[PDB]
């Protein structure tokens, strides 16, 4: 049995830690909802 616990409010935070890149990937989505890379 699964259960839920509150973790916080949904708000934008000014001056949050800015990280991560913006890559452009050629992907494929299958019937099971799984993405895969097409190269």
């Amino acid at each position: 049995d699964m259960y839920i616990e509150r973790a916080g409010d949904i708000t934008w935070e000014k001056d949050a830690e800015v990280t991560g890149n913006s890559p452009r990937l050629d992907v494929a989505l299958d019937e099971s909802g799984d993405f895969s890379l097409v190269e």
Binding site: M2, D9, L37
Partner: protein, 156 residues
């Protein structure tokens, strides 16, 4: 039980101790999460019960108590915030500029932030705090890191 708007952890006592299998959004009395987190199973909120209402394996989405309510979209230009809720760790906003997943049926936004699988269902927000999608379904690139799509449902 608790139906206040907000981000929530999805836990299970089935494995060893209490394990966080994912995360979700409560909005307008509906709980929104990724299909692979619950597999469509019922959920508990204190003494109350949440029953699945809509779901789809291909989209990897599921809603509880009512239809999918989230319909904000990434504008394709601005930076977004992943409100990451990792297992055993505090909720934390991470700002990033999304990349692009190019598919045969159109392009989808994608956030390149590496988090544990139990972080699946964490909301991605626009500058207004509106949920533009959920983190947890993407791909593993060459080094082993995860790049997730900004997965959004459809408000009927």
């Amino acid at each position: 039980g608790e139906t206040t708007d907000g981000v929530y952890r999805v836990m299970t006592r089935r494995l060893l101790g209490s394990t966080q299998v994912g995360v979700g959004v409560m909005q307008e009395g509906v709980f929104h999460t990724m299909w692979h987190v619950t597999k469509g199973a019922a959920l508990r909120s204190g003494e109350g019960r949440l029953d699945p209402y809509w779901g789809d394996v291909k989209q990897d989405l599921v809603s509880y108590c009512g239809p999918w309510k989230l319909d904000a979209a990434w504008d394709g230009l601005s930076e977004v915030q992943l409100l990451a809720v990792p297992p055993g760790e505090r909720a934390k906003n991470i700002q990033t500029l999304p990349g692009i997943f190019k598919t045969k049926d159109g392009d989808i936004g994608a956030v390149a932030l590496d988090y544990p699988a139990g972080t699946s269902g964490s909301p991605i927000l626009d500058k207004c705090g509106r949920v533009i999608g959920l983190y947890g379904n993407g791909v593993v690139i060459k080094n082993g890191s995860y790049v997730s799509a900004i997965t959004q449902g459809k408000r009927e």
